[PDB]
Amino acid sequence: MKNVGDLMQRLQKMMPAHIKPAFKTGEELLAWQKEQGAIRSAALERENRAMKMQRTFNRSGIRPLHQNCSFENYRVECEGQMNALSKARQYVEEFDGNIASFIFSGKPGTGKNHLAAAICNELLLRGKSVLIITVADIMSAMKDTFRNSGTSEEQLLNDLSNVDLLVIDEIGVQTESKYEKVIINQIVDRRSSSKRPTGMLTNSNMEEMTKLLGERVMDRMRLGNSLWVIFNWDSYRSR
Amino acid sequence: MKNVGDLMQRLQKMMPAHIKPAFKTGEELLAWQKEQGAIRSAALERENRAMKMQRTFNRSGIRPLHQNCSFENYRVECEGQMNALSKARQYVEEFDGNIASFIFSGKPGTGKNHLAAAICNELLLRGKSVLIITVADIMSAMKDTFRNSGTSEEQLLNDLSNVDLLVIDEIGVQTESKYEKVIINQIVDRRSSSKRPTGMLTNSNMEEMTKLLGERVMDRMRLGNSLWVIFNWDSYRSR
Amino acid sequence: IRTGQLDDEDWARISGTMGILLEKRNIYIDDSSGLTPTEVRSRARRIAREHGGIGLIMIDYLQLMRVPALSDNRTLEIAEISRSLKALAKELNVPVVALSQLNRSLEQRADKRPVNSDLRESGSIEQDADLIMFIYRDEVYHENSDLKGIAEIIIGKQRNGPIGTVRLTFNGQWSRFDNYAGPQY
DNA sequence: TTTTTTTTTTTTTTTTTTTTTTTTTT
Ligand SMILES: Nc1ncnc2c1ncn2[C@@H]1O[C@H](COP(=O)(O)OP(=O)(O)O)[C@@H](O)[C@H]1O
Numbered sequence: 001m002k003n004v005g006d007l008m009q010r011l012q013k014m015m016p017a018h019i020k021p022a023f024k025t026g027e028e029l030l031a032w033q034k035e036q037g038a039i040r041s042a043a044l045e046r047e048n049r050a051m052k053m054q055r056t057f058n059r060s061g062i063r064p065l066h067q068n069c070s071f072e073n074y075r076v077e078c079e080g081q082m083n084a085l086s087k088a089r090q091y092v093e094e095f096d097g098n099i100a101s102f103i104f105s106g107k108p109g110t111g112k113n114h115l116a117a118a119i120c121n122e123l124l125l126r127g128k129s130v131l132i133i134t135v136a137d138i139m140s141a142m143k144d145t146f147r148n149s150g151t152s153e154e155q156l157l158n159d160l161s162n163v164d165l166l167v168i169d170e171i172g173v174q175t176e177s178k179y180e181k182v183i184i185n186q187i188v189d190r191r192s193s194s195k196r197p198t199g200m201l202t203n204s205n206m207e208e209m210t211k212l213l214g215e216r217v218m219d220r221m222r223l224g225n226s227l228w229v230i231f232n233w234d235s236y237r238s239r
Numbered sequence: 240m241k242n243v244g245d246l247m248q249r250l251q252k253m254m255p256a257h258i259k260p261a262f263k264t265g266e267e268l269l270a271w272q273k274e275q276g277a278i279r280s281a282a283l284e285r286e287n288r289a290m291k292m293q294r295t296f297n298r299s300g301i302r303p304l305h306q307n308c309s310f311e312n313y314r315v316e317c318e319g320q321m322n323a324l325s326k327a328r329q330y331v332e333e334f335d336g337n338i339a340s341f342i343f344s345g346k347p348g349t350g351k352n353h354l355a356a357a358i359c360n361e362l363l364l365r366g367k368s369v370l371i372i373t374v375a376d377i378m379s380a381m382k383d384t385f386r387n388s389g390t391s392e393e394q395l396l397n398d399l400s401n402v403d404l405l406v407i408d409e410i411g412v413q414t415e416s417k418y419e420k421v422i423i424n425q426i427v428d429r430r431s432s433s434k435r436p437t438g439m440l441t442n443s444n445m446e447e448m449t450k451l452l453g454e455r456v457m458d459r460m461r462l463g464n465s466l467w468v469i470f471n472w473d474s475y476r477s478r
Numbered sequence: 479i480r481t482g483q484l485d486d487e488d489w490a491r492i493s494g495t496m497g498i499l500l501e502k503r504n505i506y507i508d509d510s511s512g513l514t515p516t517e518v519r520s521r522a523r524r525i526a527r528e529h530g531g532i533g534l535i536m537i538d539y540l541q542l543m544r545v546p547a548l549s550d551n552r553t554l555e556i557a558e559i560s561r562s563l564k565a566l567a568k569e570l571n572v573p574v575v576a577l578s579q580l581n582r583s584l585e586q587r588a589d590k591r592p593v594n595s596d597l598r599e600s601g602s603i604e605q606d607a608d609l610i611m612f613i614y615r616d617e618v619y620h621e622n623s624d625l626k627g628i629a630e631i632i633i634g635k636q637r638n639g640p641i642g643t644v645r646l647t648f649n650g651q652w653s654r655f656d657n658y659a660g661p662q663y
Numbered sequence: 664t665t666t667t668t669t670t671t672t673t674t675t676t677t678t679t680t681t682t683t684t685t686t687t688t689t
């Protein structure tokens with residue numbers, strides 16, 4: 001009824017001019033489809049990694065309180081602030097494949113979570129996973145996992161070990177639970193021994209910590225540049 | 240249409256000279272085939288045994304912190320170190336068909352996992368199965384196994400029994416749990432009763448440990464040369 | 479496309495794929511419903527003699543194929559169908575993609591990956607074939623999945639090649655499977 | 664006969680850690 005030019009012309013009756021069909025042949029169309037497919041695959045994988053964190057846990061790795069939490073806003077007051085801040089910077093930069101833990105010890109209100117979240121904000125741009133979490137919330141996850149037979153705590157610990165940068169928060173408290181001890185040592189065991197990093201946040205001293213944190217745990221924490229940064233300062237929000 | 244001559248000539252047209260078949264006959268064919276059959280079956284059963292615990296679980300064997308763990312990076316300090324290294328070597332050399340266990344004891348930072356992993360590194364290349372593991376990780380696997388009915392704690396225990404050298408780590412902590420004790424003693428019962436070796440790694444003394452590993456399990460471990468080898472040094476990473 | 483709500487880049491890519499497909503004149507779609515293997519062989523032999531020789535056939539939802547002789551017995555109907563299609567493929571020396579539905583046996587199984595058994599009728603199709611490859615897309619069954627946008631092609635039989643489980647990405651907004659250069663399987 | 668899909672009723676087989684408040688008597 002109608003031929004090549006006539007059909008394409010009946011179709012240019014719709015589309016305006018200066019139309020570069022962009023392929024003209026098959027040898028190129030397959031290649032373009034290949035390219036776009038690899039791109040969409042990468043994006044899809046990113047999205048599903050994110051969803052895996054949202055399903056295994058709740059609470060997207062950084063919270064909306066420490067979300068706008070880069071290095072820049074960290075107001076400077078003293079020299080230890082540089083000893084912490086620039087050390088954090090080189091810790092981020094030298095993080096790649098580095099077995100380098102860290103413990104920020106210090107009083108509350110000092111910006112421990114703040115710099116530990118600046119780290120994580122950077123590593124999100126790097127393309128890695130993160131999680132700031134409280135041990136209370138971890139044990140809550142455990143004890144909720146006990147309920148349902150769809151997820152299990154070994155699956156949970158594997159989800160934790162599969163994380164790139166895990167950090168723990170509110171550890172200095174002397175909760176005496178055997179079942180907290182067996183988890184808090186096992187996690188860092190499964191991470192360090194699996195050749196992955198981790199870094200805690202505390203309010204305590206080394207020996208204050210070392211009876212709660214077993215000798216093995218401190219041993220598997222102290223590697224390379226173990227980063228024993230400490231805050232011996234006055235709280236921020238009282239200013 | 241065609242005979243041996245013309246056909247094999249057209250065959251050499253494909254493939255060049257000096258391709259001599261190395262069979263020439265009907266019996267050597269089947270003989271070498273059976274030879275390769277058994278050789279293939281060797282690595283086949285090897286792959287089965289080694290993929291059990293990488294399909295169900297991860298990292299079955301030595302784990303990447305203690306992988307690059309030759310005997311020779313072992314730093315020399317004292318006669319205790321000489322005793323440890325030398326006795327480890329002779330334990331490996333007299334390993335085959337020899338019911339001999341090991342219970343290292345002492346503080347961390349001394350080379351328990353180090354020596355166990357050097358041992359297991361060698362017994363890999365000798366052709367034997369190995370698994371360094373935490374008791375917490377075993378119990379985590381159990382508590383996950385209760386979920387699915389396809390697998391079973393029976394299946395995992397028989398798999399551990401199928402291992403040549405089962406070893407245990409971080410047993411020193413005093414968890415009194417019934418379901419932990421049944422596993423920790425039943426495993427040794429199954430292995431030793433089936434004429435199979437293993438060995439443990441702890442911190443405490445024989446008596447303080449023996450309420451955790453029953454008199455039964457301890458005496459059933461202490462066969463041949465029990466190899467109690469003890470470390471009473473300072474931590475390595477303190478240096 | 480079925481709304482006309484499209485932009486210049488899209489108008490262009492349509493022009494391109496169109497102006498490609500017109501130049502070759504490969505494809506030949508039959509929009510007739512209740513065909514028989516007789517008619518399939520006829521049409522295929524017709525496109526064969528004229529246009530060189532064909533290279534591929536696709537048959538959507540095989541079970542609609544008929545042969546009124548065996549309309550009283552359905553299993554034998556499908557058997558005749560399958561033999562006819564195999565003989566066709568052997569005649570013209572091409573492949574014959576022949577879709578087929580599955581039965582509702584894999585629903586009461588908790589795995590939902592189809593097996594070679596779960597074919598819609600007669601079980602000859604699990605015998606007359608050189609290749610089966612089912613499809614499985616977990617996001618249909620599991621909303622709790624971290625495996626979405628991902629459709630895997632469970633091979634289930636191949637007489638001259640390996641079994642497997644291939645993995646690909648589904649984007650049904652434009653009705654395509656694409657390659658999944660991702661982790662292993 | 665033997666295949667196949669569909670619904671409906673019967674039996675049988677399979678199951679751990681957690682956290683608390685007590686509250687004694689020294
Ligand atoms: N040097 C600083 N500059 C800017 N904000 C700070 C500083 N130190 C503390 N803060 C603020 O104080 C809050 C508490 O610090 P954070 O580390 O989150 O808690 P904690 O001090 O208990 O670890 C943060 O929300 C942060 O905004």
Ligand SMILES: Nc1ncnc2c1ncn2[C@@H]1O[C@H](COP(=O)(O)OP(=O)(O)O)[C@@H](O)[C@H]1O
Nearest residue numbers: 312313314347348349350351352353354475476
């Ligand atoms: N004799 C030694 N020479 C060199 N390094 C050692 C020695 N003993 C222990 N180490 C090191 O100390 C760390 C702890 O040793 P290991 O036995 O693996 O754990 P643990 O000391 O807790 O048993 C390891 O990183 C190991 O390399």
